[PDB]
Amino acid sequence: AVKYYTLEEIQKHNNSKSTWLILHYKVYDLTKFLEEHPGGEEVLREQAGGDATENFEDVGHSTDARELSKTFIIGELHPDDR
Ligand code: HEM
C-alpha cells in the first residue's frame, strides 16, 4: 500500500515540531534529521512544507545521500496535486 498526502496537508508541517518536504513526488519527514544533515538545518527549514526537488538536485547529492534519504519517506504526493 502507499499513503498519499495533499499539498495542503504537507504545508502544515513546517514548525519546530515537524518538518516535511517533497522530493520527486515523495514526502519525507526530516524532523529528526535536521541536526545530522551535513548541509545544515537552515537549508532544510527554508524548504519545509514544500517541494525542494530542484534545490536538492542543484547541489547534486551523492549516491550515499540518496540511499539514506529513502529511510525518511512516509508517502507520496497525491496524484491530483501533481
Ligand atoms: C532528503 C534528505 C537529504 C539527505 C539524506 C541529505 C544528505 C546530505 C549529505 C549526506 C550531504 C553530504 C554530501 C553528499 O553526500 O552529497 C549533504 C549536503 C548538502 N545538502 Fe543535503 N540531504 C538531504 C536534503 C537536502 C535538501 C532538500 C537540501 C536543499 C534544500 C540540501 C542541501 C544540502 C547542501 C547545501 C549540502 C552541502 C553541499 C556543499 O558542501 O557544497 N540537502 N546532504
Curated annotation (Swiss-Prot):
Topology of this chain in the membrane: Single-pass membrane protein
Main location: endoplasmic reticulum
GO cellular component: endoplasmic reticulum membrane; intracellular membrane-bounded organelle
Keywords: Acetylation, Electron transport, Endoplasmic reticulum, Heme, Iron, Membrane, Metal-binding, Microsome, Transmembrane, Transmembrane helix, Transport
GO MF term (any one): heme binding
Residue list for modification N6-acetyllysine: K3, K12
Annotated Cytochrome b5 heme-binding domain residues: 2-78
Subcellular location per the Swiss-Prot or TrEMBL entry: Endoplasmic reticulum membrane; Microsome membrane
Annotated binding of heme, by residue: H37, H61
Described purpose of this protein according to its UniProt entry: Cytochrome b5 is a membrane-bound hemoprotein functioning as an electron carrier for several membrane-bound oxygenases.
Entry's family note: Belongs to the cytochrome b5 family.
Protein name (Swiss-Prot/TrEMBL): Cytochrome b5
Organism for this UniProt entry: Bos taurus (Bovine)
Shown residues in whole-protein numbering: 8 to 89 of 134
